[PDB]
Amino acid sequence: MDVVSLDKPFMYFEEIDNELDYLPYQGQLKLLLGELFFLSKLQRHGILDGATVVYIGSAPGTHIRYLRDHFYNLGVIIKWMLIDGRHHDPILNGLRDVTLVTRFVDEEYLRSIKKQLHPSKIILISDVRSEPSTADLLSNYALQNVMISILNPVASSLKWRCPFPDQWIKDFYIPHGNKMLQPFAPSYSAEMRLLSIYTMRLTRVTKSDAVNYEKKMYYLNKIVRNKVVINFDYPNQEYDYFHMYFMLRTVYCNKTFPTTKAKILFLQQSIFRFLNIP
Numbered sequence: 001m002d003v004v005s006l007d008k009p010f011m012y013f014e015e016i017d018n019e020l021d022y023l024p025y026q027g028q029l030k031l032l033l034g035e036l037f038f039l040s041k042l043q044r045h046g047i048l049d050g051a052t053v054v055y056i057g058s059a060p061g062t063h064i065r066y067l068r069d070h071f072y073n074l075g076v077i078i079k080w081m082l083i084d085g086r087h088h089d090p091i092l093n094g095l096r097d098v099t100l101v102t103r104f105v106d107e108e109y110l111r112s113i114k115k116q117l118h119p120s121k122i123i124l125i126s127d128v129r130s131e132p133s134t135a136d137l138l139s140n141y142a143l144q145n146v147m148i149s150i151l152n153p154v155a156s157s158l159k160w161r162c163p164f165p166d167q168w169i170k171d172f173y174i175p176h177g178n179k180m181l182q183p184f185a186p187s188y189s190a191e192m193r194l195l196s197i198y199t200m201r202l203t204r205v206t207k208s209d210a211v212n213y214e215k216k217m218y219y220l221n222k223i224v225r226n227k228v229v230i231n232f233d234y235p236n237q238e239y240d241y242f243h244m245y246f247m248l249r250t251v252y253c254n255k256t257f258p259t260t261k262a263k264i265l266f267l268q269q270s271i272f273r274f275l276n277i278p
């Protein structure tokens, strides 16, 4: 891995500044970090407390247990509602504050869960997916807009991977938000998480945006993520660990540590141990 000297990683897609012509249970780690990042940002904004997290497409959702235990141990009052047609990981069983729902959501069912949660704050996390086609994605993203227009969450994190330019169909619309980059994504994934705080204006996505995404993400996965951050004071200086480190320092802990590095190391250790990563 070519060596590089960096002050910070790319945290949002907008920050990628160049382009190029296109672990065990790593998937749970990718979800866990981005959702710890998203929910920790909401905690900083004082809006996570008293909210209800509605996670659609949450199964098996092994990592969600770590998320709940994290905020439960910080004293943050959160109710979870995990909805999926598939059965969740049994490690999510027996938690009074976690509600498991075995159902594929449609418009009608989004209306009813809104009814039963209103007027409580809703935080939406979506990871629904139906290799997928461009029509599958357009259906998925429409459904996610339908989640926002009906559930009207105070914040959302949405699965967001633009369709490839060579499989384009039609321009579509997605919510405004920051496009959060995911460490420990698959080697050449172009998926981000669309993070939005609502104070919902939609954005047109065009075929040129699909070209910009494909090239920016390829540069990120070929060049950026294969670097060693040699100034990085950490047991592992590979970029994805550099990237994970900067996400993890937005996380709160009841425990006190002598240094920030000691805090990130403890958190990473905790996360890997629960996910059974060496």
Ligand SMILES: Nc1ncnc2c1c(C#Cc1nc3ccccc3[nH]1)cn2[C@@H]1O[C@H](CSCC[C@H](N)C(=O)O)[C@@H](O)[C@H]1O
Residues within 6 Å of the ligand: 031, 056, 057, 058, 059, 060, 061, 062, 063, 064, 083, 084, 085, 086, 103, 104, 105, 106, 127, 128, 129, 130
């Ligand atoms: N409507 C839904 N509601 C809820 N969950 C849904 C869906 C959905 C769909 C659909 C669909 N196709 C249609 C075709 C025609 C008409 C209407 C249609 N509607 C898929 N999923 C779940 O998304 C997960 C992705 S992996 C997450 C991984 C997870 N985040 C983890 O932590 O491991 C899977 O577990 C899957 O079961």
